[PDB]
Amino acid sequence: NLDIIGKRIEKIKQEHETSWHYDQDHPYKTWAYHGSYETKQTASSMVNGVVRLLTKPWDIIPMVTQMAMTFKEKVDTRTQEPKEGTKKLMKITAEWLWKELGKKKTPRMCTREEFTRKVRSNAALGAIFNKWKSAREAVEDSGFWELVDKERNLHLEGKCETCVYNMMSRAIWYMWLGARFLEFEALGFLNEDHWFSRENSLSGVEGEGLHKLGYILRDVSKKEGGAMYADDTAGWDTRITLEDLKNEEMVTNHMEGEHKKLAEAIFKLTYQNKVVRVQRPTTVMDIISRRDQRGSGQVVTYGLNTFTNMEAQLIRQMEGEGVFKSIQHLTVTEEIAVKNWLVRVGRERLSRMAISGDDCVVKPLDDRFASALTALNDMGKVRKDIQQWEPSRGWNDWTQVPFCSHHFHELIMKDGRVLVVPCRNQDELIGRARISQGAGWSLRETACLGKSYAQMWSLMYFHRRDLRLAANAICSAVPSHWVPTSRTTATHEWMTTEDMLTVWNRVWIQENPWMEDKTPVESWEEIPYLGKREDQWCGSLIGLTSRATWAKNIQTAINQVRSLIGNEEYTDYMPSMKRFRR
Ligand SMILES: CCn1cnc2ccccc21
Ligand SMILES: [Zn+2]
Ligand SMILES: [Zn+2]
Numbered sequence: 001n002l003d004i005i006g007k008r009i010e011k012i013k014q015e016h017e018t019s020w021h022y023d024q025d026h027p028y029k030t031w032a033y034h035g036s037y038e039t040k041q042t043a044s045s046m047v048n049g050v051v052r053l054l055t056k057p058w059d060i061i062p063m064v065t066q067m068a069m070t071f072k073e074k075v076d077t078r079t080q081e082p083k084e085g086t087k088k089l090m091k092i093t094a095e096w097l098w099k100e101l102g103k104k105k106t107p108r109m110c111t112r113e114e115f116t117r118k119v120r121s122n123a124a125l126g127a128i129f130n131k132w133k134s135a136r137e138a139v140e141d142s143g144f145w146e147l148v149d150k151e152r153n154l155h156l157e158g159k160c161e162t163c164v165y166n167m168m169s170r171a172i173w174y175m176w177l178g179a180r181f182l183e184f185e186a187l188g189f190l191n192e193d194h195w196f197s198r199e200n201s202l203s204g205v206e207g208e209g210l211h212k213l214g215y216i217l218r219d220v221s222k223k224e225g226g227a228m229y230a231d232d233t234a235g236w237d238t239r240i241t242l243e244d245l246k247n248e249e250m251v252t253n254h255m256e257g258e259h260k261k262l263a264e265a266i267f268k269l270t271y272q273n274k275v276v277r278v279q280r281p282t283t284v285m286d287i288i289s290r291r292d293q294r295g296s297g298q299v300v301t302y303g304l305n306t307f308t309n310m311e312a313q314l315i316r317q318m319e320g321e322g323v324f325k326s327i328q329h330l331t332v333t334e335e336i337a338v339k340n341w342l343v344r345v346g347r348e349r350l351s352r353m354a355i356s357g358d359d360c361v362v363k364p365l366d367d368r369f370a371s372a373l374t375a376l377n378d379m380g381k382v383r384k385d386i387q388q389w390e391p392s393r394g395w396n397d398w399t400q401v402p403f404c405s406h407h408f409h410e411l412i413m414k415d416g417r418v419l420v421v422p423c424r425n426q427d428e429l430i431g432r433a434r435i436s437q438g439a440g441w442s443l444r445e446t447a448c449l450g451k452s453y454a455q456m457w458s459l460m461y462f463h464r465r466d467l468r469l470a471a472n473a474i475c476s477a478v479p480s481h482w483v484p485t486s487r488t489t490a491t492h493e494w495m496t497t498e499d500m501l502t503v504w505n506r507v508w509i510q511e512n513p514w515m516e517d518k519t520p521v522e523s524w525e526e527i528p529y530l531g532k533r534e535d536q537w538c539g540s541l542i543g544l545t546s547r548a549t550w551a552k553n554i555q556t557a558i559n560q561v562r563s564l565i566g567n568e569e570y571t572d573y574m575p576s577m578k579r580f581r582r
Contacts, residue, residue: 005289007161008275009034012287023284030078031276031288040284044070046436050450053561054473058430067431074235075171079292079380084198085327086378089318089338093311094247096342100350100412100482101195102254109259110188112145115181124488125184126165127177127299131153138177150177155182155265156258162270163522165276169235173276173295183270183297186263190251190303198370200451201311205404205512206303209491210460211507212407214408214420216354217361217398223352226367228401230358232384236358238296239380245292245420247311249303265391271296277523286329286413300386303358312349313362314342317349320369327374361403368452370394371511411463413528417517419508421463426539429461430470438487447565450474455494459504463530465542472573473554478559479568501576552578 002009013020014546016037026033047068052513056063082090118125119135132138151162163179165436175183196204198216233239249267252260272467278286278346294301318324323341324334354361362369371391382388395401399408405428411419435452436446454474457467469540482501484495492502493507504527521527529535532542541547548556562570 004160005275007159007287008465009287011161012037012164012277016285019284021056022262023286024097025282026286027280028076028288030076031290034282034287036286039279040283041279043261043438044443046438046548048434048436048446048450048453049431050447050477050561051453053564054450054477054557055430055434055470056557057541057544057550058434060546061427063425063427064431066127067428068435071169071235072171074169075167075293077238079239079241082241082243082378082380083325083327083329084302084327084469086375088330088335089315089324089327089375090243090247090311090379092335092338093314093342094307096251096339096346097307097311097314097550098250098254102199104200105193105195107251107255107259107263108189108193109186109262110184110192112181114141114188115184116182122487122489124298125177125180126172126174127180128174128360135177145180148181150181152177152185152262155269156261158265158268160265160269160327161202165274167276169414172298173235174507175297178350179270181296182262183266183300186259186266186320187300187303188296191299196303196306201306201310202314202347203353203355203536204306205354205356206306209402209493209507210406210422211512213354213404213406214422217285217403217408218410218420220352220354220361221398223363225352225363226369227363227364227396228398229362229364229369229392229394230323230385230401230403231360231392233358233381234384236309236381237301238309239382240292240294240324240382242272242292244379245491245499248307265357290448301396302357304356309355309358309360310353312353312376312381313353313360313380314349315379316369316372317352317362317364319372319375320364322368327378347533353414354447359404361401367394408535408545409463409530411528411530415519417515419528420465420514422460422576423464423538426464426466428539429467430492433457443565446480447478447561448482451478451482452495453502455484455496455503456492459507460501462504462524462527463535464538464540465529465535466530466540466547468529468549468556469577472576476570476573477558478564478570479565480571481569525578526548554580565570 013035019037020035023036042419069260106544116139119139125135127135132141154161163182165173166557167173185539187285194200194207196206198204198208205213231557252263253266257264272291274290276288278288280286294305296304316339318341323337324330330338352363373389377388381393399410401407406422406424409421410422411421413419436449451474454471458470461467472489483497496503501524509518509520510516530538535542
C-alpha cells in the first residue's frame, strides 16, 4: 500500500497545495481514493471531406452517418481471488509458457536510441503535453534524460516518484514520456523481438497482417477436433487479477543484471500498484490507486493480454480433456499430470489456437471444451453475452468464425488459385474511412488520409465491388505522387507510393506461403470479387439506384474533388475496371 505509492501521492499533493481536499462525496468503491485538486479542460471525431464526397450513396445510410456523431462503471468493479486449484494451474502453465516463449528468444533492454527512432516516426506511445511541446522535442533535450535518469536510479532503489497514470468498453492510460521510456526499456523486447509471432508462440499472430489471418484460421480448421470456439471476454482489462500480474512478472525469471531489476520495478511499482488521475465534472482531478486490472502501455498490454489469454485457453483445454477434476484443489499427482500434459502435448494445443490479445479462436480436441467453464469463470475471464454456466456455441465453418473484427472468405481466381480474404460489414469500413481524429488538418493532409484508406481497400477489400470502385475514385481524385499518411500507425503494406497492382502481387502471390504457383497477375481484371449475392450479404449497395448513379457518374465526383484540391498531377485509375475500360 502507501509505502510504494505514497511518494507519487506526496509529490502531486504539493504541486496543488492551494487546492488539496479529501472530498466526502467521492464516487469510488473499488478504487482507493486519496484527494482532489482544481483543473478545467475536455477531442470529438471529424469528417474526412475527401472520402465523404466520393461515397455519396452512404450519406443516407444511418449505420455510416451515425458513426461520425457524438463503461467507467466496469473499471469500478471488483474480481474475487481464484481458488487454490486455479492459482496452481495458472502458475504451472505460466512457468511452462515463459520457458517455451524463451527457448528461441533472449530478453534484453530496449535503448534510448530505439525509443528516439520510434518518436521520430510517430508510434502511438501514449504520452502527455508540461515542459516540452510534443514527444519529438523532449527526446533531443538532455534535461528530459536527467529526469529519466533520476527515476531510473529510483527504480533500482525499489521506489517510484513520477510513474502516474492519466485516465481517458475502452479506457486509455496516458503516462508522461519518461515513464513510457522506462516501461519500453524493460519490456519493449516482447514486441520489438516478436515474442508473440506465430513462429515463436504457436498461438500468437503478432506481425501477421490481415491478409494472413484467414489462412491461419483455415490451417487451424484442418486439425482433427471439435467446433471452433471464439468466446469474447466481458471487459478483459478489468478482469486481470493480481495473480495474473504475478504470473506475467515471471518473465523476469529469464532476465539478468540491471534488466532483471529494471523489469521487476516496472511490474512491482507501476503494474501491481498504480496511481491514476481522473477528470470528474462535479471539474476536479481525483488521485485514486488500485493493485489489479490492466493499465500499462497499449503495446505491452497487447503482449501480456496475449500471454495470459494463451494461458487461460490452455487451462480451459485441460479442463475439457479431464487433466484435472476440480479447481478447489490440485492433488500432488494432478500437478505432475498437468506438467506432463504441457511437456507431452502443450505445443500441439497452442497450435490449435489463434490469439490476438483478449481475442481468441480455439479448435479443441473435442466439444467437451464447450461446457468446461469452472477454471475460465474462476480465473475471472467471464464470457460476454451468454449466462455464466450455459455451454459455448461453436462454429462449424472457419469462414463464419469472427476474429480481429473480421470474417474470412475463400475466393477462387479465374486461374484456379485460392485467395483467403478478410471481410467485415461494408458500412463499418465506409463509416471508419469517413472519420479523422484531431485538429489542424490541411486539405492535403485530409486527402493523404483518404488515400491511405483507399490503398488499404485495394489491398485487403478488393473483392468488395463498392470498395474497389471507391478506392479507384479516391486514388484518381488525390494527386498521384502525394504520400499516404496516418497520425496513429499489424503490417501496413498499403502505406507506400508504389503502384498498388505491384504491391498486390507481392502480398497475395510472391510472399504468400499458401500460394505454390508464383505467376504474377498482369491486371486488376484477373483479380476476383465475392459472388454478387455474398457482396450484398456483407453490405454492398450493388443493385440500388443510388449506387448505379454513383458508379455511372463517378468521373463527375472525381472532378469535384480535383477542382477543390486544384491544378495538380492526377492519374485516372477508373479504366483498371472492365466497365470504365471503353
Ligand atoms: C465438462 C464436462 N461436460 C461435458 N459435456 C458437458 C455438457 C454439459 C455440462 C458439462 C459437460
Ligand atoms: Zn517510476
Ligand atoms: Zn464478408
